Write a protein that binds this DNA or RNA. Structure first.
Ligand SMILES: NC[C@@H]1O[C@H](O[C@H]2[C@@H](O)[C@H](O[C@@H]3[C@@H](O)[C@H](N)C[C@H](N)[C@H]3O[C@H]3O[C@H](CO)[C@@H](O)[C@H](O)[C@H]3N)O[C@@H]2CO)[C@H](N)[C@@H](O)[C@@H]1O
Ligand SMILES: Nc1nc2c(ncn2[C@@H]2O[C@H](COP(=O)(O)OP(=O)(O)CP(=O)(O)O)[C@@H](O)[C@H]2O)c(=O)[nH]1
Ligand SMILES: [Mg+2]
Ligand SMILES: [Zn+2]
Lengths: 405, 99, 208, 83
RNA sequence: AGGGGCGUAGUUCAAUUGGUAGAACACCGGUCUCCAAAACCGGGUGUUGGGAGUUCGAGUCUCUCCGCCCCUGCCA
RNA sequence: CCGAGGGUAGGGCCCGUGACUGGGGCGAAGUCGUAACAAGGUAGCUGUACCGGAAGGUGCGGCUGGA
RNA sequence: UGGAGAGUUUGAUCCUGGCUCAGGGUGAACGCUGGCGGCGUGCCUAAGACAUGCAAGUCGUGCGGGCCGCGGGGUUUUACUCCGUGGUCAGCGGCGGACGGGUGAGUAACGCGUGGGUGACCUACCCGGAAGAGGGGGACAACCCGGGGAAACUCGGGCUAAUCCCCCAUGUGGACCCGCCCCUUGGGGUGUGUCCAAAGGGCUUUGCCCGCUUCCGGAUGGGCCCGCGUCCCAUCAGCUAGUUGGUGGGGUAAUGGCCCACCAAGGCGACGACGGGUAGCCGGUCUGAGAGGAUGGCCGGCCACAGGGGCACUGAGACACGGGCCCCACUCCUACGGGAGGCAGCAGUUAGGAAUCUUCCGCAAUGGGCGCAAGCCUGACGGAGCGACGCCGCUUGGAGGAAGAAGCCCUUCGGGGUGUAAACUCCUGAACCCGGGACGAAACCCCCGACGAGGGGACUGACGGUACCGGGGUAAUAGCGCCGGCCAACUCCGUGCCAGCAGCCGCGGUAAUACGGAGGGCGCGAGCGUUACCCGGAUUCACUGGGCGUAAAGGG
């Protein structure tokens, strides 16, 4: 009584970011109801169970990235719903470190806010090629030409961090209303009810523009872990979004990064939104029941590669670029004793900055060949992509140029 | 969820109900018998006894009582009805109990 | 597994010129024939008086190293010699002798026991027609040990065999130098084996 | 009732049944009444099935009920042969 | 994963108007001795938890990060 | 009638814990004295009794394992 | 065919005596290291709580039907829908669900072990003997109509079949009362009286096969009882009312205070009663010269238990692991009156802990249940998987190869070691490649023959394309402990009663074979060490086999 996942259309992960109280979640629950009627295989979610965590619920806000499944007769999507605020950025950044495309969300009444910025900024440093805006809260005071000013300054923001801002498809409407009628209108297609048709402008808007990225299942295998759950009577399940290759029940895999020595196992099962996946492929968002391992051994930040491909390494001499202060990065300099927080895939393990001979300083812009030793052995390869935050603002970005041990 | 072992249960209640009665009968019918044997009613006494020795021994054919059980009741109904028909009885109708 | 490592070094330590290479060990250089003292930074210094335990340990190591066996097998074998009837001091050697890879050595098919092994290990030998690759295999009396056909034409099988010309195998073995056969006629007696080892002591090391 | 069957022995991948009279309810390799033979389904030795007839017959003549594969063996040793 | 605490020499602890950090006992060094103990001289010996921030200058005020304790979460 | 279990009451044994309090073992070089070991400078030891910072002292009897 | 000691109290000695070491054993755990195969073996803690799936059914050759598709159209067509004949879903009826599988919580007990007793008894299915199987009557599901319910499902009315129940007859016989004979606790023969039997089903049809009924004999499996044996505390010394016995009743398959009235006053205890503690018991396991000591995990046997506590029903058998009824805790559902569950079955989760596994493959074999049989069910079982947990086998190479590279380490600066070790030259061939390819499986069944004996023929392989075999073919893992004495093995430097070692005695205070590192050496090797536990040494609870004047110990 679980059912097998029938992979028909291609899968793409889209996340939903943006400041607080701007409809991020509702707009999410919306896509559920909207895309529902016009096709089965969706399973409806509401503003309530999208945020099932007590407090998250009882208290009001969204605290953990959701994870919803809704399709179109065109393309199958997996919707990762990030939280607003700051504080939880460590949970949006992990949600973002996945999603192929980001459905940005701004509010007509408020306009681009402090978090609206950073989120976009994180997207430009996480690696979310492609953003879609969705002005929400439009059903507010007749703004003949005010909501227009939003799309004028929001685009300014996107084209302010290397994003096709002028091209970005800025749909308009309200999710509440859109939702509301649907809420009391289970069955019912588009080209009918007012606002409901405003959601589709967005959905379709996604089937287009937004890609479906160069994917391969020929290289080894890799899967950065986003979370780990203990499934009763089953065992330890680790989720994430696949990188290269594929994985099916019965395969060997190693858990690499953030521990003494890596443990190898055998996958006991795979799924995708509770659907018994027969063989998750790259770019797929899966769940992996790892044979006989404990929730004390798997941890968000390590990988699940194929045995023998990519070991854990602490010291790594890697080339790196440093965001200038104008880029909202660093406005000073660091010594050969600097200890920042790098972000490899979904994890951030703090490392040192043992700077090379003759570089008695490093300020905004710039990009030298400095070494570093992490305090937690993490799965590293040759050319891995990473960023460098600290204090509450990204400061650089580079890739492994060489590996020490 | 459930098993076709309830058939065995239902099946049971009946059989229960079955020999339950075949059993009550023998109790009552054997009381009345000695009550009349102590009283002296030699005739209508054996009349009943001999009619119980019947109901009893039939319990054995089935799964109610059985063998030595059935026989036991008897050797305490005759061994009894006889030790009563001595109270100035002279078993007139030597129906079942041989002299 | 089988020691594998410097050998004339053991030859040394023990003192008694041990034969673990066959060929060169008859040469003017068994090393023992060149530096008759124990290996190591010391080896040639006043030898203290050996505890009865040393004497026994040393006498056992001597014997055991002479076969290339591991302690596990060696002892386990000894313990069996205890149970069987008759002077175990003897039986033991008889069992150490009845070992397969050894008899391959005791027949010339191989210059040294280390070699005898590899030979046995790689099919090269044949017991009563069928081929055995178990060095540990216990040859029983009246059995025939012989080189496997696929091997006869090998540079080695030849020479070692070429040497058995005019030579005689231990009084308890028979040998057909022409056809690479050879029978395990009788279980060798303590006498028949001129070993530089006092089996009597080896028995003592294993009591207390 | 009392039966004549095979009770396993030997090692894994080396079946070595023992022909035995025993209450049907006893577990397989459990305790029996009497031992009457052995049967190596892999026949290794000109001695792959011994069976005491005299006794095998006693049991049969009292109720002992053989298995199909236990009759074949019994028979093969000629338990029924009368002439 | 989200809250809240705690980290000053060796060991207990004080300086929070923002100003190189002392107080006791330890401890090291020297003299005497085989060597200590005692005695007598002489020396804070610190990663203020790490790294940055603001600052003319941070134990203190910001922030990020490490370890530990406490509460609340957490079914592919 | 019997009857698992529940209740009211009064006992018995056990595991843990408690303000305070008794002595004990152990811990290089802190204080007081000097009881024993040589009439150990009052022969020693002992049962008992009383007294004393502490070792101990005294009484009565006993022992020699004191001369 | 069987017996070894050593270190340590002293300035030294002999004795006493304790501690400790050398051996062996383990369901191990922990550290470092880890290549292969086979056979074993793997929750010692929470008898804690557990999602999910699966672990017990099977017979139409017992019976009637519901449904789907074919034979002839009852009639001439659809109508009172009748048969022929294999698939399907329950029902009724039989036999099995009491065995197989799990566990050790409880239990100091005739629970177990051992040898006996039953004139005091039971035994389904299975064999062997004897006798029958004659007639009659009826109900209840299934199904149809109605009513209630969210659901789990239950109530009213109406038929209906049987190997279902019931009643009479026959009575080889069997049961019961009284009497006689023999025997001697209730057993064997016997007499008058009374009471009790049964079912048809399939065919190849006055005969077979399968059932049925009663009775005797036999097997197998059991109940009960008795002698003897079975841990600690006596700082547990007195215990007992169903208490001990009797008589008469109830109960049972059967003896019995097993249960009850009545009468009596007993029963038990230093030969350890009563109480408290701990514990499943044995075959066996480990150790020991033995006598002993310790132990009860694999496997086999017996007991006991199935969430906790009690109960009876059916039944040859249970007071029943995946049956029922009640109570309790707990978890779950609801349409709020009632429903659901119990992995100490398999696999698995979590909690606890130093620690103990796959949600596997297959009924091919062996065993079990039902069946005429085909065959269906079989997490028994046969296999595979994971872990050096264990034992055993196997590899990391073999033969040459210098008065002897280098690097490192000692150095009386002459030289010495690591060392044939390396390099190097050949030689072999783990791996890998290609190819064939199992044993385990002959019988159920069919055929000549009486479904007799006997003969011939056919199907069936999870493990596995594995094992094993042949062809070609690459040098292709090594670690861990230790070196003061006991105990196999020594030098340099660093450190300086510091840091640290340590099983016991002890090492370290500026030349440390004892600390840390290095070179060297010894031991073992896919392992080596550590901790824990048992026996041994320990004649150190002494039966074998000790002692007490002053060593512990003679009682005032
Ligand atoms: N274990 C000692 C027992 O207690 C008493 O002895 C205890 C004390 O009286 C004795 O004290 C002595 C003192 O007497 C002497 N004059 C000076 C010495 N420094 C102290 O020593 C004691 O204290 C020091 C710390 O100050 C510890 O390091 C030492 O180990 C300890 N024994 O030390 C003992 C504690 O270890 C009894 N007299 C003795 O008979 C008894 O067995
Ligand atoms: N007027 C208006 N209010 C809306 C709209 N969409 C959402 N809201 C309001 O915002 C509330 C919750 O918004 P939500 O979607 O959870 O915000 P969010 O983007 O998840 C903010 P965070 O994730 O950081 O907690 C709704 O209950 C509603 O009152 C809209 O389109 N118009
Ligand atoms: Mg939200
Ligand atoms: Zn040599």
């Amino acid at each position: 009584a679980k059912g097998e996942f029938i992979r028909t259309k291609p899968h793409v992960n889209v996340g939903t970011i943006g400041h607080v109280d701007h409809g991020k979640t509702t707009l999410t629950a919306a896509l559920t109801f909207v895309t529902a009627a016009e096709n089965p295989n969706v399973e409806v979610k509401d503003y309530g169970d999208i945020d099932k965590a007590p407090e998250e619920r009882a208290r009001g806000i969204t605290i953990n990235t959701a994870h919803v499944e809704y399709e179109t007769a065109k393309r199958h999507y997996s919707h990762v719903d990030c939280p607003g605020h700051a504080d939880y950025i460590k949970n949006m950044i992990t949600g973002a470190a996945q999603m192929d495309g980001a459905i940005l969300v701004v509010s007509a009444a408020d306009g681009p806010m402090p978090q609206t910025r950073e989120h976009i900024l994180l997207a430009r440093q996480v690696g979310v090629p492609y953003i879609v805006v969705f002005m929400n809260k439009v059903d507010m005071v007749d703004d003949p030409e005010l909501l227009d000013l939003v799309e004028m300054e929001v685009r300014d923001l996107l084209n302010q961090y290397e994003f096709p801002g002028d091209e970005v498809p800025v749909i308009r409407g309200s999710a509440l209303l859109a939702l509301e009628q649907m809420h009391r209108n289970p069955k019912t297609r588009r080209g009918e009810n007012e606002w409901v048709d405003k959601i589709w402008e967005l959905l379709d808007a996604i089937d287009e523009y937004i890609p479906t990225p160069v994917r391969d299942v020929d290289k080894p295998f890799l899967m950065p872990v986003e979370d780990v759950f203990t499934i009763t009577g089953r065992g330890t399940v680790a989720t994430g979004r696949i990188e290269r290759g594929k994985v099916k029940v019965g395969d060997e895999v190693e858990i690499v990064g953030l521990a003494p020595e890596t443990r190898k196992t055998v996958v006991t099962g795979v799924e995708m939104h509770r659907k018994t996946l027969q063989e998750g492929i790259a770019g797929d968002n899966v769940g992996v029941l790892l044979r006989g391992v404990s929730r004390e051994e798997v941890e968000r930040g390590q990988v699940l590669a194929k045995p023998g491909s990519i070991t854990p390494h602490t010291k790594f001499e890697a080339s790196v670029y440093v965001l200038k202060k104008e880029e909202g990065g660093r406005h000073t300099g660091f010594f050969s004793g600097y200890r920042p927080q790098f972000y490899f895939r979904t994890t951030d393990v703090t490392g040192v900055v043992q700077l090379p001979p003759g570089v008695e300083m490093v300020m905004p812009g710039d990009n030298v060949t400095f070494t570093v030793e992490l305090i937690k052995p993490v799965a590293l390869e040759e050319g891995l992509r990473f960023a460098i935050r600290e204090g509450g603002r990204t400061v650089g970005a580079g890739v492994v140029t060489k590996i020490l041990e | 969820r459930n098993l076709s072992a309830l058939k065995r249960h239902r099946q049971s209640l009946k059989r229960r109900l079955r020999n339950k009665a075949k059993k009550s009968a023998i109790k009552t019918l054997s009381k009345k018998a000695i009550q009349l044997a102590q009283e002296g009613k030699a005739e209508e006494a054996l009349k009943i006894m001999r009619k119980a020795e019947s109901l009893i021994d039939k319990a054995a054919k089935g799964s109610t009582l059985h063998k030595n059980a059935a026989a036991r009741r008897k050797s305490r109904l005759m061994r009894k009805v006889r030790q009563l028909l001595e109270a100035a009885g002279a078993p007139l109708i030597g129906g079942g109990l041989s002299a | 597994g089988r020691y594998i490592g410097p050998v004339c070094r053991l030859c040394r330590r023990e003192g008694v010129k041990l034969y673990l290479k066959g060929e060169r060990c008859y040469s003017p250089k068994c090393a023992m024939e060149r530096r008759p003292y124990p290996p190591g930074q010391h080896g040639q210094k006043r030898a203290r008086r050996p505890s009865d335990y040393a004497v026994r340990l040393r006498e056992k190591q001597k014997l055991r190293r002479i076969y290339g066996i591991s302690e596990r097998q060696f002892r386990n074998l000894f313990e069996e010699a205890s149970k069987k009837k008759g002077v175990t001091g003897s039986v033991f050697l008889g069992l150490l002798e009845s070992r397969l890879d050894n008899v391959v050595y005791r027949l010339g098919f191989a210059v040294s026991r280390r070699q005898a092994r590899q030979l046995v290990r790689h099919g090269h030998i044949t017991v009563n027609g069928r081929r055995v690759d178990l060095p540990s295999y216990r040859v029983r009396p009246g059995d025939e040990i012989a080189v496997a056909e696929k091997s006869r034409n090998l540079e080695l099988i030849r020479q070692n065999l070429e040497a058995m010309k005019g030579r005689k195998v231990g009084p308890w073995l028979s040998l057909d130098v022409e056809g690479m056969k050879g029978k395990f006629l009788r279980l060798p007696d303590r006498e028949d084996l001129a070993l530089p080892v006092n089996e009597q002591l080896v028995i003592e090391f294993y009591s207390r | 009732m009392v039966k004549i069957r095979l009770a396993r022995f030997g090692s894994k991948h080396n079946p070595h049944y023992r022909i035995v009279v025993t209450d049907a309810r006893r577990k397989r390799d459990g305790k029996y009444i009497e031992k009457i033979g052995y049967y190596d389904p892999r026949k290794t030795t000109p001695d792959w099935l011994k069976v005491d007839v005299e006794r095998a017959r006693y049991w049969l003549s009292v109720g002992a009920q053989p298995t199909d594969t236990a009759r074949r063996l019994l028979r093969q040793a000629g338990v029924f042969r009368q002439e």
